[PDB]
Ligand binder design. Structure first.
Ligand SMILES: CCCCCCCCCCCCCCCCCC(=O)OC[C@H](COP(=O)([O-])OCC[N+](C)(C)C)OC(=O)CCCCCCCCCCCCCCCCC
Ligand SMILES: CCCCCCCCCCCCCCCCCC(=O)OC[C@H](COP(=O)([O-])OCC[N+](C)(C)C)OC(=O)CCCCCCCCCCCCCCCCC
Ligand SMILES: CCCCCCCCCCCCCCCCCC(=O)OC[C@H](COP(=O)(O)OCCN)OC(=O)CCCCCCCCCCCCCCCCC
Ligand SMILES: CCCCCCCCCCCCCCCCCC(=O)OC[C@H](COP(=O)(O)OCCN)OC(=O)CCCCCCCCCCCCCCCCC
Ligand SMILES: CCCCCCCCCCCCCCCCCC(=O)OC[C@H](COP(=O)(O)OCCN)OC(=O)CCCCCCCCCCCCCCCCC
Ligand SMILES: CCCCCCCCCCCCCCCCCC(=O)OC[C@H](COP(=O)(O)OCCN)OC(=O)CCCCCCCCCCCCCCCCC
Ligand SMILES: CCCCCCCCCCCCCCCCCC(=O)OC[C@H](COP(=O)(O)OCCN)OC(=O)CCCCCCCCCCCCCCCCC
Ligand SMILES: CCCCCCCCCCCCCCCCCC(=O)OC[C@H](COP(=O)(O)OCCN)OC(=O)CCCCCCCCCCCCCCCCC
Ligand SMILES: CCCCCCCCCCCCCCCCCC(=O)OC[C@H](COP(=O)(O)OCCN)OC(=O)CCCCCCCCCCCCCCCCC
Ligand SMILES: Nc1nc2c(ncn2[C@H]2C[C@H](O)[C@@H](COP(=O)(O)OP(=O)(O)OP(=O)(O)O)O2)c(=O)[nH]1
Lengths: 117, 96, 54, 368, 173, 167, 48, 341
């Protein structure tokens, strides 16, 4: 850790210096009211980008939060296979992956994995 | 005291979490933002206590599973909020 | 003799959204009797892009 | 949609109709019996409406026969004043107090200004409402579509027309709207609505053709009154329902032929609207999953009593609709001691029912 | 030593977090703190296995709420608070000063790091996380994991039913 | 700072009694005041908020002090520590209630509400019973609390013997 | 006799029932804030 | 369990969640069961046909999340200092746990959310909230042994629960304030025993189980609707409303027996002063119950006349009539009950 943090800072300093060189090495010209205008294919923009952007994969978005938190429970598997009771480890692991598949196929069949339409 | 040198900091952080959960911000999401802030601090203390035990840290996974579900459920209720009120502002709800 | 029965004026007591109305509460109105509040259809503002020419 | 000529023969149900008149369909019934398996191209709802005395009934019967549709006769107050055993409640009216005296269409055409008119109009809305729900149960449990003469959606026209003529008061109209608002939202709008636009002069001639005693003798069917109905159907009802239901307009299919009309219906396509999910047209009948089908079926098959309990809206500031307490006691005495009203239908021994000692059954979606 | 400086930063970022209003300002504050708490937890433990897991778990939650922030609270405002910047910077340096002149043998947490353990402890010579995560998958505690599974799957049925996907997208109408 | 009211006889340790009663005057005042400033009055600004704290707590301190002084003054003046003293005490706090509420009647009647309240408290002190005593009977089960167990896991063998030890 | 009896008691009880109504007519945040204040006091007494 | 197969699941998972809490031999295990219970109730509670229902789904969620959060906070703190699930001598750290549990159940000082979320619930939802959701919270409070904190909640519960209820006309909101009062009796019964509490809770749920059906079967939500409600036999309507008196705990009816056993034990334990404040405050609760009976005890009314008929569900009504019968004649069966001796 403490080694990694030091190099993490050292890299961040180095990368930071890079633009601090770029900001000075960059040619400097007077900024225009149009030069800094946004790019939207050369025609002025109708709509701010900060309007509410509708969402259609919201349902998947929530399911993503869940499925990760079961990744927290499969990852330890390997580490404790040499040390655990094989029946308990075998049984539980399987009924862990079957539960996941059944959940997935259930929603897939119910059509929730499809986007809002 | 022992509790002041070792357990004070997380508790002071926890109450600051709650004071976020009650302050007046327009958007409901401000509650969700502060929700997993508190959970982050609960993990920190729980992880202090579990480590007083030599090998009991496995229960951290149990706690995290319930952390996401309340956040995940908290996010679902917000979705259902939108499709009846159209917006998530607190002041938009009937005061009762 | 004439016999009194619970009349419309007697029951006006219970007509409001609250027994003892005041300025704050009298302004209110009784909820829908079926207890269903249909959500109201609102505006639809869609983002726009001048896709092209560049 | 597919007439007998198109199918070349009688309707072939996909699966046996569920005996919805005799067995309940609750949640635990829905597990083993599914709803979508019975729906065909003809599983739709048709409302055959029009002005007064436009031969809707004759047209509906013929129409419902071609499309293999169930035909539901238009509601009338005989459904309230004639009990199951057939006894006529109106015979009891000499006993009843004047406010509780029986009131019918005959009375409306003869003393339209009587305060019981406001009562009479709400009853028609309530009757149509119950009948309309009965049609939905038939549709959802049998898959055979239904043909209705006048839906509860179109009933507010008569109340509104009566209001313009001044028969009703402000209060009665205010009460009616609250009932309609409290209740109308829970129905499924019809797939198709057919209108028979008879011009105002024609219907006035046509009414005299029936030569019904009270109607010809009456004054209600004036140019003003009959004109009001025309303005209300086309400007308020038809303009609104067309956002959901397909709309066909004829001068008079009652005077015209129905075989041409059935061939007009089959031309109309009911799938082009299915493409977009949120398309208003036929939105109500768009169920994504099998659960949604069953939920709607449960609501009308199993929760109709709830649907008919929403008509309890307390409004007493209106004096016409209120029934005095002294009358209520007297009316309760006469009404419920009449032959066949002592007990629920099918239990009044004095009317000839037998085996009550060993009888324990009651009807489903039955009263009481 | 950095443990005390970690104490200072987690305190500092928490003070400002109480004062954020813009949802993304909250998010950036929270994301920074999730790094420190993750770092700090592994100091007082036999391994950083849980910091990896915690970091991974929360990052999943970080993305999702941006997606909803960018759809619900997209149009909001920031305000640099000169009171806040001075206050945090004022205390931050103040706290950093203490950590240099602190009896930081006393401030260290008594929880036994892996090296803090004795040399005789035979159970400390196995894989880094073998024993600790062990009885998560052994009788009788394994059934708790199984109970989660239904709980998580049953949750997966709750979201779709609360959500009612078919009745449209989500917009801040 | 921590003085108990009845630590001494009735006509004693005035400074001890005033602190004891003002303690409960402040606590109740703040407790109600917290609801008042958030839920009912809802003042705006950091200064007026204190006025609600002072308004709800201030006179409520005046009441407690008045009762102690009048009760203490009566105890010495009459020459006996009897129930009428606390009755005499209550009417003082009631008088302060009227001045607080600007109402002649409210102070008078509330004194009686407070007057009989104090009398019963003296009754308790003099007869030897308590208002919220520690429960003497505290039941933690039914009749078969040690019998009704439904768990399935086999309890492995014991490690303690009720028998007298062997050596 | 009925000033200390019923009719006044009702006129007072109803008056309080009005006050409790306003105390219930607040945002959800205020009630939770009230709870957090209670927690903070207990925590503060814990340090003592 | 009314609409779809999914509703069947959420009900069961609620049972499992509650059981895990009350069968757990440690705070942490208990806290998990609360989380299981939390998400079992919300989907049952949220319906998008109502703008009000989703608001109810919110206030409950924010409150319960905070309660479980603070509950876990103290439990970690509790065994950080004692290293046991139990505290040898109760102190502040145990008080904090009590405060969360009371808020979890909506006791007096932290009840505000509870009536204010009752506007947008169906009757069957309110029953699940009023009766079952109060099992797990109140049952854990039996472990903690703080007197003054628990005692304060009782005194405020009966007071706030009663006085607040006088001003309501919405039956759903009225029952909430009525339920807060009965909650006060439980906590009083909880500092003395549990077997009384177990008995008292069962009777409380019984009566609420009855009154909910009568409103649920006939979809009544406002006092006016009671007067407009049509019944064939005014004798029948008169008798159905005689359940409110039992809910008021009048001795001729079954609903007093619960109140009765809570006094024969509180008095046995010398808590005389508490009973005065409680029993006296119950009168105010008994008051607005009579305001409902105005629509039954008088028995000739001015009623709207576009209804001649009662349309009611059989099975609910069939079970409701059975439950009502005992609610009026259940007293003579005290001989049979052997759980008080
Ligand atoms: C693509 C869709 C094809 C048509 C629908 C699936 C046909 C294959 C039948 C597989 C078994 C039923 C799966 C199903 O519909 O979900 C359970 C549906 C309801 O789905 P649900 O959306 O209400 O969620 C179900 C939740 N659990 C699993 C907890 C109950 O029906 C049932 O639950 C009980 C009846 C099962 C048999 C139905 C056939
Ligand atoms: C909810 C989930 C959110 C998940 C995303 C978190 C990060 C989003 C931060 C967006 C920028 C916030 C901001 O505007 O603050 C401006 C702040 C200043 O705040 P400010 O208030 O002064 O800005 C407004 C300025 N005036 C007053 C003039 C209008 O500037 C910063 O320093 C932000 C630096 C952001 C650095 C880029 C972050 C990338 C992180 C990558 C992953 C981690 C490695
Ligand atoms: C101002 C504050 C200064 C403090 C530094 C803040 C920046 C943090 C950058 C370091 C992050 C990496 C890290 O510290 O990892 C620590 C830990 C390593 O644990 P281990 O598996 O034992 O490997 C050790 C190998 N020598 O592994 C972990 O704990 C997980 C680390 C995840 C790192 C994600 C990358 C973050 C990048 C910086 C974002 C800002
Ligand atoms: C041997 C297993 C037999 C399984 C039979 C599945 C046949 C067809 C699968 C399929 O994809 O057909 C379409 C069907 C429709 O489902 P839909 O709601 O439209 O969601 C998108 C589906 N691609 O898709 C589905 O409904 C289910 C798709 C996933 C099924 C996986 C079952 C695997 C069992 C092992
Ligand atoms: C049920 C409600 C019951 C409320 C009151 C119960 C207590 C009854 C009064 C008991 C009593 O002792 O009253 C007499 C008492 C005189 O006793 P004492 O204080 O010694 O003064 C005169 C002798 N020196 O003087 C008093 O205690 C004052 C009694 C005032 C009662 C006002 C009502
Ligand atoms: C009627 C409203 C009365 C409010 C309650 C009055 C009160 O607080 O009296 C008790 C209090 C403390 O008295 P004590 O028995 O010594 O218990 C202290 C334990 N720390 O205060 C006292 O010392 C009792 C003084 C008599 C108060 C009579 C009020 C009437
Ligand atoms: C007009 C209204 C004006 C505004 C209100 C003024 C009153 C404000 C009071 C605010 C302070 C309230 C809190 C007081 C806390 C006192 C301690 C406590 O919590 O109650 C216990 C107390 C004595 O405790 P106890 O169980 O009797 O044991 C002996 C202790 N030495 O118990 C007692 O001492 C009880 C004293 C009152 C008993 C009254 C009984 C008669 C009631 C007649 C009506
Ligand atoms: C010595 C004085 C006489 C003894 C006092 C007994 C009080 C009983 C008062 C009463 O009769 O009830 C008061 C009230 C109903 O009063 P009512 O006459 O019906 O007013 C019209 C209501 N629409 O009904 C109520 O207020 C509810 C009953 C509350 C009684 C105890 C309240 C004490 C609060 C402290
Ligand atoms: C006017 C409004 C105010 C009404 C009066 C309020 C004051 C009520 C009295 C204060 C509460 C209860 C006092 C008490 O506990 O009395 C106990 C007394 C002592 O008996 P003991 O059992 O031996 O004590 C324990 C062992 N030392 O022995 C007993 O007293 C036990 C006998 C029953 C006492 C019940 C007292 C409550 C009466 C309430 C009346 C309510 C007003 C009705 C009008
Ligand atoms: N006041 C009132 N009268 C109605 C209503 N609906 C129908 N009627 C009355 C109006 C006429 O007096 C009479 C006309 O009956 P119909 O138009 O329904 O004719 P019917 O169905 O008997 O056969 P047909 O239309 O010729 O096919 O019934 C209503 O909603 N309110």
């Amino acid at each position: 850790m403490f080694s990694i943090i030091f190099i993490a800072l050292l890299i961040l300093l180095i990368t930071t210096i890079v633009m601090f060189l770029a900001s000075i090495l960059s040619k400097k010209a007077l900024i225009d009211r149009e030069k800094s205008s946004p790019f939207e294919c050369g025609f002025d923009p109708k709509s701010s980008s900060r309007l509410p952007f509708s969402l259609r994969f919201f349902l998947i978005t929530i399911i993503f939060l869940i499925f990760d938190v079961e990744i927290a429970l499969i990852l330890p598997m390997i580490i404790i296979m040499k040390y655990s009771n094989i029946m308990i480890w075998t049984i539980t692991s399987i009924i862990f992956i079957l539960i996941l598949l059944i959940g997935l196929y259930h929603e897939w069949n119910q059509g929730m994995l499809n986007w809002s339409n | 005291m022992i509790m002041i040198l070792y357990w004070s900091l997380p508790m002071i952080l926890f109450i600051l979490g709650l004071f976020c959960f009650v302050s007046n911000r327009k958007h409901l999401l401000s509650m969700l933002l502060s929700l997993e802030f508190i959970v982050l601090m609960l993990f920190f203390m729980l992880f202090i206590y579990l480590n007083m035990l030599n090998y009991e840290s496995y229960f951290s996974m149990m706690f995290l599973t319930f952390s996401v579900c309340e956040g995940a459920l908290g996010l679902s209720i917000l979705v259902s909020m939108i499709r009846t009120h159209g917006n998530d502002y607190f002041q938009s709800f009937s005061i009762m | 003799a004439a016999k009194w029965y619970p009349d419309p004026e007697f029951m006006k007591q219970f007509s409001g959204p609250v027994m003892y109305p005041d300025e704050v509460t009298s302004l209110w109105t009784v909820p829908p009797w079926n207890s269903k509040v249909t959500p109201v259809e609102k505006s639809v503002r869609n983002l726009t892009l001048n896709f092209g020419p560049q | 949609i597919s007439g007998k000529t198109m199918r070349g023969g009688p309707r072939v149900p996909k699966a046996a109709p569920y005996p919805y008149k005799t067995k309940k369909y609750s949640v635990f019934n829905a597990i083993f019996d599914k709803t979508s398996k019975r729906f065909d191209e003809n599983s739709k709802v048709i409302c055959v409406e029009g002005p007064i005395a436009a031969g809707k009934s004759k047209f509906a019967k013929e129409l419902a026969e071609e499309l293999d549709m169930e035909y539901y006769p238009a509601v009338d107050l005989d459904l309230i004043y004639i009990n199951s055993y057939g006894y006529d409640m109106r015979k009891l009216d000499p006993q009843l107090p004047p406010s509780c005296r029986s009131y019918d269409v005959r009375n409306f055409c003869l003393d339209p200004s009587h305060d019981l008119a406001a009562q009479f109009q709400i009853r028609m809305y309530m009757l149509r409402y119950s009948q309309y729900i009965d049609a939905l149960q038939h549709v959802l449990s049998t898959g055979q579509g239904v043909v209705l003469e006048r839906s509860p959606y179109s009933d507010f026209v008569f109340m509104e027309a009566m209001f313009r003529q001044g028969y009703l008061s402000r209060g009665a109209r205010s009460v009616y709207n609250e009932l309609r608002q409290n209740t109308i939202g829970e129905l499924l709008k019809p797939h198709l609505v057919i209108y028979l636009d008879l011009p105002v002069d024609a219907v006035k001639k046509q009414i005299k053709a029936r030569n019904v005693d009270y109607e010809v003798q009456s004054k209600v069917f004036s140019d003003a009154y009959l004109s009001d109905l025309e303005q209300l159907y086309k400007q308020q009802y038809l303009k609104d329902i067309s956002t959901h239901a397909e709309l066909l307009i004829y001068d008079w299919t009652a005077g015209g032929e129905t075989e041409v009309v059935v061939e007009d219906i089959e031309r109309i396509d009911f799938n082009q609207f299915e493409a977009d999910i949120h398309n208003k047209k036929m939105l109500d009948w768009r169920f994504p999953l099998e659960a949604e089908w069953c939920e709607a079926r449960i609501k009308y098959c199993h929760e109709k009593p709830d649907l008919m309990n929403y008509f309890n809206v307390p409004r007493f500031d209106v004096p016409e609709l209120v029934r005095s307490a002294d009358d209520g006691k007297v009316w309760r005495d006469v009404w419920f001691n009449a032959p066949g009203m002592k007990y629920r239908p099918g239990y009044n021994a004095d009317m000839g029912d037998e085996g009550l000692l060993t009888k324990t059954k009651i009807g489903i979606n039955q009263g009481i | 030593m950095i443990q005390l400086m970690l104490y200072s930063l987690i305190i500092t970022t928490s003070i400002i977090f109480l004062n954020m209003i813009h949802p993304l300002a909250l998010g950036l504050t929270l994301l920074i703190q999730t790094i420190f708490v993750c770092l700090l937890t592994g100091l007082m433990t036999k391994s950083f296995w849980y910091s990896y897991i915690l970091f991974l778990i929360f990052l999943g939650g970080m993305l999702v709420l941006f997606i909803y922030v960018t759809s619900l609270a997209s149009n909001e405002m920031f305000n640099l608070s000169m009171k806040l910047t001075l206050f945090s910077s004022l205390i931050l340096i103040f706290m950093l000063i203490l950590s240099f002149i602190m009896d930081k043998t006393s401030s260290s947490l008594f929880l036994m790091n892996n090296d803090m353990q004795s040399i005789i402890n035979m159970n400390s010579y196995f894989m880094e996380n073998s024993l600790s995560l062990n009885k998560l998958y052994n009788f009788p505690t394994n059934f708790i994991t199984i109970l989660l599974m239904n709980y998580l799957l049953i949750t997966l049925i709750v979201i779709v039913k609360i959500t009612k996907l078919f009745k449209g997208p989500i917009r801040m109408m | 700072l921590r003085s108990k009211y009845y630590d001494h006889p009735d006509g004693e340790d005035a400074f001890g009694k005033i602190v004891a009663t003002n303690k409960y005057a402040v606590s109740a005042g703040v407790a109600w005041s917290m609801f008042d400033v958030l839920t009912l009055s809802k003042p705006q600004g950091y200064l007026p908020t204190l006025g609600r704290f002072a308004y709800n707590t201030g006179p409520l301190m005046g009441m407690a002090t008045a009762f102690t002084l009048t009760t203490l003054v009566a105890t010495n003046a009459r020459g006996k520590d009897d129930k009428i003293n606390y009755l005499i005490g209550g009417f003082a706090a009631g008088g302060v209630f009227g001045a607080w509420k600007h109402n002649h009647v409210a102070g008078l009647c509330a004194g009686l509400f407070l007057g009989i309240a104090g009398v019963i408290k003296k009754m308790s002190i003099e007869q030897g019973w308590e208002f919220f005593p520690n429960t003497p009977i505290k039941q933690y089960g039914g009749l078969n609390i040690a019998g009704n167990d439904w768990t399935i896991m086999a309890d492995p063998p014991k490690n303690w013997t009720t028998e007298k030890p062997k050596e | 006799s009925e000033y200390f009896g019923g009719q006044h008691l009702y006129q007072k009880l109803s008056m309080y029932s009005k006050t409790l109504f306003l105390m219930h007519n607040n945002s959800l945040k205020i009630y939770l804030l009230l709870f957090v204040f209670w927690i903070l006091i207990l925590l503060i007494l814990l340090f003592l | 369990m009314f609409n779809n197969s999914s509703k069947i699941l959420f009900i069961t998972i609620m049972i499992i969640g509650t059981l895990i809490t009350v069968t757990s031999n440690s705070w942490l295990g208990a806290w998990m069961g609360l989380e299981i219970n939390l998400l079992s109730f919300i989907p049952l509670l949220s319906d998008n046909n109502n703008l009000m229902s989703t608001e109810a789904s919110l206030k409950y969620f924010l409150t319960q999340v905070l309660a479980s959060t603070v509950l876990l906070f103290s439990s970690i703190l509790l065994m950080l200092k004692n290293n046991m699930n139990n505290e040898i001598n109760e102190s502040f750290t145990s008080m904090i746990i009590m405060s969360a549990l009371l808020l979890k159940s909506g006791a007096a000082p932290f009840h505000f959310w509870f009536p204010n979320m009752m506007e947008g619930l169906t009757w069957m939802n309110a029953l699940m909230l009023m009766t079952w959701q109060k099992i797990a919270p109140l049952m854990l409070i039996s472990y903690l042994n703080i007197k003054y904190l628990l005692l304060i909640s009782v005194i405020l519960s009966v007071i706030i629960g009663a006085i607040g209820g006088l001003n309501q006309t919405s039956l759903r909101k009225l029952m909430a304030f009525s339920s807060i009062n009965h909650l006060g009796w439980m906590l009083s019964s909880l500092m003395i025993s549990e077997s009384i509490w177990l008995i008292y809770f069962f009777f409380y749920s019984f009566l609420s189980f009855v009154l909910t059906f009568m409103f649920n079967i006939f979809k009544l939500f406002h006092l006016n609707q009671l007067f407009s409600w049509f019944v064939n036999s005014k004798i029948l309507k008169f008798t159905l409303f005689m359940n409110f008196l039992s809910l008021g705990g009048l001795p001729p009816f079954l609903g007093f027996l619960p109140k009765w056993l809570v006094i024969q034990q509180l008095t046995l334990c010398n808590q005389y002063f508490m009973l005065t404040l409680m029993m006296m405050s119950t009168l105010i609760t008994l008051f607005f119950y009579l305001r409902i009976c105005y629509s039954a005890f008088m028995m000739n009314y001015f009623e709207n006349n576009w209804i001649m008929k009662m349309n009611m569900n059989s099975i609910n009504y069939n079970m409701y009539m059975i439950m009502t019968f005992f609610s009026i004649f259940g007293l003579f069966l005290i001989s049979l009950f052997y759980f008080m001796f």
